[PDB]
Amino acid sequence: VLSPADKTNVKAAWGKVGAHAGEYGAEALERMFLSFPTTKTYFPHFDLSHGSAQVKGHGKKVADALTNAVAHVDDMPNALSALSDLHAHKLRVDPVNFKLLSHCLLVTLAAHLPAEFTPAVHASLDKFLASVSTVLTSKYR
């Protein structure tokens, strides 16, 4: 469960993403596919070598889907219900993979936004990613 300070950090740091949204989401996914190859089995219909325009694209999609949640933070079950329906009923994504992407995002963020990736911020982003992780892997229709 997020504190007020946590929502504050998440919107202040994620807000530094901006135009780079697409790039970061893309990179985070790339990091997951290379670091944790089993996660590629959720993406058979994807071209997955470096520079796939598709991974780049469904990189902006996560990043923006993520953009979704930072402002509707107080109610993601609502804002993300389509995304839950997708991840929890269709694909049945094992929660472990959410922790992997989450970790990969923290890495992408720590590599690109150093002045921003403070320990307190790090803590808040992990919770945030954990909480959107719970939303997307639960069937609550």
Partner: protein, 146 residues
């Protein structure tokens, strides 16, 4: 543990640039902040009350070095990791009953710390290789639980 030769060169190159003096501290430090329950294990350390507190503590920072050397230890010869950490396994498992999930968390916060210090130099291929390493080290630390 099976890194490719190019992965091995890549991690060795990067480890060579690590500040074996602070990153250990930043690794342990972030663990205590990001998973605050791990502070239970360090009460003899002092003021872990605030992020700035934990972060800026000669205690958390002294200990970190130990941690880093254990990793460098592991980095050196990556074909017998079970052996090198055997004592630390007993220590953590048998003595301190540290839940092994915690070991993976620290390895991952280390990856975070490395990405922090190297930015664009911490590429996806290089991370992928450190993930094999921290995974290797974690599984060895938790072996006495086996």
């Amino acid at each position: 543990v099976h890194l490719t030769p190019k992965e091995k060169s890549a991690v060795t190159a990067l480890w060579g640039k690590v500040n074996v003096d602070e990153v250990g501290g930043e690794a342990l430090g972030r663990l205590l902040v990001v998973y605050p329950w791990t502070q239970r294990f360090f009460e003899s350390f002092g003021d872990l009350s605030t992020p700035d507190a934990v972060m800026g503590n000669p205690k958390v920072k002294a200990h970190g070095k130990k941690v880093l050397g254990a990793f460098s230890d592991g980095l050196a010869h990556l074909d017998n990791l079970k052996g090198t950490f055997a004592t630390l396994s007993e220590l953590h498992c048998d003595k301190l009953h540290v839940d092994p999930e915690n070991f993976r968390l620290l390895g991952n916060v280390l990856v975070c710390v490395l990405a922090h210090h190297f930015g664009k130099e911490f590429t996806p291929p290089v991370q992928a290789a450190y993930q094999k390493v921290v995974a290797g080290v974690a599984n060895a630390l938790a072996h006495k639980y086996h």
